[PDB]
């Protein structure tokens, strides 16, 4: 005889599969790396309260690989592992809501992550993988651990690495529906139609004959720049040089608010190392 317990395993937390544990923490034999509610428990003996509980495993099956493709829209077997490795840290992060927007108290170099999160909360964008959509909803609700871990997983980055906001947005825009966007007499459409590594000012298009997007972004290397209230949606500031520094977020909602981790700065005008500026676009 053996005192066992039945649990559930899943890869998307939608399709659950019943499995058996025999009060052994050696998940590496048959079970594999497991994460209870986001926190790795691959070397934790099954508790008495581990009844009818849901566990996260990596796709060892074709059924699980199919479910992972259906929920994450990915073809990488290590994607879930990367996502769960990021989640084991982002679960302990704090996500303060600042006047309706959700940021991150800085920890493990989440500066660019917090800036991208604050940006995505202020631009109209619909994601294609259901994982990103549900994580974004939960983030706009105040819990953003899953969204930030997903962002890390989709960018092949790890908790602690440095990061550039523009490349993160470029990775995210591949999983977004941007085929409707158009820009020119060189014809452009898609992700290339909403970005510009160059003039920060939208109004500076004197060096763009039409735009057909729900939002646009411009980007330059960190330049001392004055942001006029009411001219833009949001922007990002990079204090430091190229090799090392830190990102802050600036929004123009009523006044020039500035989010730095969990800190808020109010200002009528602003002048600082701006690098990205986002703008509303009806058509």
């Amino acid at each position: 005889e053996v005192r066992t317990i039945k649990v559930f395993t899943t890869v998307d937390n939608i399709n659950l599969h019943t499995q058996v544990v025999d009060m052994s923490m050696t998940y590496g034999q048959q079970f594999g790396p497991t994460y209870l509610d986001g926190a790795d428990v691959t070397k934790i003996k099954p508790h008495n309260s581990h009844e009818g509980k849901t566990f996260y495993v990596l796709p060892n099956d074709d059924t699980l690989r199919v479910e992972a493709f259906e929920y994450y829209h990915t073809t990488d077997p290590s994607f879930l592992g990367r996502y769960m490795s990021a989640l084991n840290h982002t679960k302990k992060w704090k996500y303060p809501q600042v006047n309706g927007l959700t940021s991150i108290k800085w920890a493990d170099n989440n500066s660019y992550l917090a800036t991208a999160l604050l940006t995505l909360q202020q631009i109209e964008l619909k994601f294609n993988p259901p994982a990103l959509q549900d994580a974004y909803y939960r983030a706009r609700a105040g819990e953003a651990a899953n969204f930030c871990a997903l962002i890390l997983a989709y960018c092949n980055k790890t908790v602690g690495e440095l990061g550039d906001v523009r490349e993160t947005m470029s990775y995210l825009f591949q999983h977004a529906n941007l085929d409707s966007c158009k820009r020119v007499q060189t014809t452009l459409k898609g992700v290339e139609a909403v970005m510009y590594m160059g003039t920060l000012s939208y109004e500076q298009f004197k060096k763009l004959v039409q735009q057909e997007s729900p939002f646009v972004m411009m980007s330059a290397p960190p330049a001392q720049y004055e942001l006029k209230h009411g001219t833009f949606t949001c922007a990002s500031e990079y204090t430091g040089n190229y090799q090392c520094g830190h990102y802050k977020h600036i929004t123009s909602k009523e006044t020039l608010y500035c989010i730095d981790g969990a800190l808020l700065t109010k200002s009528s005008e602003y002048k600082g190392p701006i690098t990205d500026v986002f703008y509303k676009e009806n058509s």
Binding site: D62, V66, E70, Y112, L162, D164, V165, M197, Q243
Partner: protein
């Protein structure tokens, strides 16, 4: 929804891969590569004598469980000289192979202009090119154009 799709390569092999209705042909090729060993860009699939576009969905093609696809993997061997652009406008030429990883191309452009491997990224046709993936997975044509961006390392 989700079902098994049979793939045959002009012989006694008829192996099934578990695919979905909301899956494109490129993801199908990647799933085939995950168990056959040949990179996805070398593969070419055909259903009912019709080449499948890598961007189209299996639902748009009328594929189902009562169907079979024929695979022929292409025999790419030649290299190609491609144009890499700089964020300031500079252009350089690099002779690469579709089987070389993107990491080797970053090393090449680094040694060309002495930039740190972790100090920049690159992108073809608007898609950011992942590091550990092959170049042919992005459809690098001969004499094409690849963009290079200097990532602002910050955190």
């Amino acid at each position: 929804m989700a079902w098994d799709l049979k793939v045959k390569m002009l012989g006694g092999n008829d192996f099934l891969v578990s695919v979905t209705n909301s899956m494109t042909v490129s993801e199908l090729k990647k799933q085939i590569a995950q168990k056959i060993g040949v990179p996805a860009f070398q593969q070419r699939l055909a259903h009912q004598t019709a080449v499948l576009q890598d961007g189209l969905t299996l639902s748009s093609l009328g594929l189902g469980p009562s169907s079979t696809v024929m695979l022929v993997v292409q025999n790419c061997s030649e290299p190609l000289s491609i144009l890499v652009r700089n964020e300031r406008g500079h252009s350089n030429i690099y002779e690469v192979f579709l089987t070389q990883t993107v990491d080797t191309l970053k090393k090449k452009v680094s040694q060309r202009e002495q930039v740190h491997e972790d100090q920049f990224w690159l992108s073809f046709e608007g898609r950011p090119m992942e590091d550990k993936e092959l170049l042919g997975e992005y459809g690098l044509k001969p004499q094409c154009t690849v963009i290079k961006h200097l990532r602002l390392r910050g955190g």
